Design an enzyme around this catalytic site. Structure first.
Site, PDB file in Angstrom:
ATOM      1  N   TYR A   1     -66.708  -0.363 -10.334  1.00  0.00           N
ATOM      2  CA  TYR A   1     -66.981   0.931  -9.751  1.00  0.00           C
ATOM      3  C   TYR A   1     -66.411   0.899  -8.338  1.00  0.00           C
ATOM      4  CZ  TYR A   1     -69.722   4.807  -7.644  1.00  0.00           C
ATOM      5  OH  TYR A   1     -70.074   5.990  -7.049  1.00  0.00           O
TER       6      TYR A   1
ATOM      7  N   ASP B   1     -71.733   3.689   5.639  1.00  0.00           N
ATOM      8  CA  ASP B   1     -71.966   4.879   4.819  1.00  0.00           C
ATOM      9  C   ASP B   1     -73.344   4.795   4.165  1.00  0.00           C
ATOM     10  OD1 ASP B   1     -71.644   7.259   3.254  1.00  0.00           O
ATOM     11  OD2 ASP B   1     -70.134   6.340   1.906  1.00  0.00           O
TER      12      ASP B   1
END
Lengths: 156, 157, 157, 156, 157, 156
Positions: free
Chosen positions: A6, A91
């Site tokens: 991913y 993030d």
């Protein structure tokens, strides 16, 4: 033997977008990865709708539910969690994904640009990680034999 | 009568963060559904009582990091609710991870945003892990014995 | 003195189901080990207080489904015991799923079968997820502070 | 690249048995599936004992424990959770399996016969699902790139 | 005022084990943060009240094993703390497994070593699953409402 | 199709070391296993340091953290949990690994030397196991179709 990943990476800033392109080039050249059957978020936007061109979808809860669900589904149905990690532009979204990856029993690999490797990272990012490497080591990383190691850098 | 304990998820790295921290803590002191004395506050539970802002020698110490990281996880898993003090313009990667871990340990995840910022767009994945999100002025009164899923009244970017 | 909260797993789609529902709720009201006021009852926690039997316009509404589904999960994970009111001749796919989710969140799974039906064969997988299964007349008195594994006294098909 | 599945499907009724045969024919023709190494319950009855011919085993707790265990083991050691789902004949057993599959981090795919696709399904079935499709789409479903989508039908 | 329940993880197969068992149980009786009456003690919860030391006919009985195994798991998952009475020279494979299961169910894992042995090397994986490890004389007084991660003050082999 | 394993086995005693060599010979001859990409602890000692030759590392918490982490990482990133199990020399470390394997949704297989198969094993070891077999059955075990069965032996 190839593993799928991913592709956890931001696309909001210059340093982010640079790191993105480098990591994707790296994977294209890595023989242990099946990139074609990996989950790349930007290629899996719900119903192909581009939120840049239609920001009305930021208040649509169905849009959000599906996108959020698809991204989680991306993590759980692939072998490795990859997190492109910029220390000066950390993030909250990637943070969450790393927690989810842990909960689904995936190897969590962080990749930091070499110009930044060594710089301080958040303690919890350090902790979720099974390993963290320089961008230059990604082309050659053996994903069939992934191992635990410590970041050789600071943590706050 | 019935009281729940929380994990005090909150940054302390900026001025707005530190402000939000102080407000949320005062809120909990006044909430009758919370046992704050037995709750887990990270800043009071760093390894050896030492924080790396005050002692930068610990920036490269792996024992300090291992134990602090472990104790923070232990804080989440042994308390009833996951609380995340959340600034939309100063989102924290650390808290992001904690929210995921709380999900995996089956905790209610409640975000608290300062009133001055409630409504502002939040990250998609923060929206998603959350069970619910409230304004700081709701926190003194929130009934933690009957916690419910609800959608944020604001955007997501 | 010590009280546990539950998630009220029960169908409301048939006459026998609705009967069992009313009986089990009266049972809990009288059980001194249960805090029913802080328990999660689904029918009182549908999104916007609206049920699709009474407002069929919501049958195709994905917001209503997402929030209700989420709130039901939230109900299971933030309460202590998973209770499943179970009719053997009218087994519910919804409750089936809830039992699995409760297992994954580490809750005691207790089935309650009406006395008139206790002994009748139950689905293998329901038998298996269950920690224990009891007659409706045992529910007023069950000690939820000391919940134990036991085998059903009946068949499985 | 092939993925393996767990064949979640009832065999108690006419509509169930029809759907079963269709879904199995579909998989035989799907190039992304390894059916030979998938877990099909009816081919994995404990010690080959047929409970139709020996119903005395319905009161045997060891028989039940092993069968129940083997079916769970089937779900956890395969890649995808497949649920053949009839809306008018919803199965409490399948319900449970879907919950278990979620807890083990599997893609949960429901397959509804086309004659029934659109009909109301239980809310929690809708919720556990990552996706739900018509039986006719199963022959061609790409199990290497499985994605989140909503059922295009009613839910109670 | 606030009390936690535990799972009494302890062997009973040797003399040192049986000694440690008796000591730890006396400890808990005197600890004001523990509800021992509602805690799970395995030896009081074997299937049909029967133990295979006293009734060796049950050594090959699969019903007895299934239910006892299930009830022990149920004991871990429905109590607040995982307690492991641990002898370093007589380490138990059974308790080893329980520690792993407790980890998976998000419980505080506390080991208690007899004072006469505290400091002696323990297995790496036991060290690792543990949140904390203490001497038997600390157990009467341990505050289970504020449980913390700490490193063992001893070796690991 | 090959599956990878985690080689859970003690190396502290004569019976342990015998069982180790037998099980490794068995795997080398098993066509369903990828041994090259399996996690063998003794080949994955942190920074190659041999704790026999440098016992000062038994008081080093960083050494312990990494080793412990690497072994868990070994379990979670491989397909099957293998436990070489000696009934008279039961291992608290292996016990823990079996619990962890369960929590990560792996098939748990125990292998007992034939000279010992039948002897009493701990109840919780019996319980975590999906199956337990004789060492002689390991060369031929089908890891693509792993199934639930009970130990044919005593339990305390």
């Amino acid at each position: 033997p190839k593993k799928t990943i991913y592709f956890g990476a931001g696309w909001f800033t210059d340093r982010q977008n640079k790191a993105y392109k480098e990591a994707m080039e790296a994977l294209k050249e890595n023989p242990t990865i099946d990139l074609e059957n990996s989950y790349v978020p930007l290629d899996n936007q719900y119903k192909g709708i581009r939120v840049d061109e239609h920001p009305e979808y930021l208040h649509d809860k169905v849009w959000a539910t599906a996108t959020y669900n698809n991204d989680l589904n991306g993590i759980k149905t692939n072998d490795i969690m990859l997190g492109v990690y910029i220390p000066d532009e950390e993030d909250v979204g990637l943070g969450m994904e790393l927690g989810y990856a842990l909960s689904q029993g995936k190897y969590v690999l962080l990749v930091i640009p070499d110009e930044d490797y060594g710089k301080p990272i958040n303690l919890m990012s350090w902790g979720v990680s099974d390993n963290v490497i320089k961008m230059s080591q990604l082309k050659d990383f053996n994903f069939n034999k992934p191992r635990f190691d410590f970041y050789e850098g600071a943590v706050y």
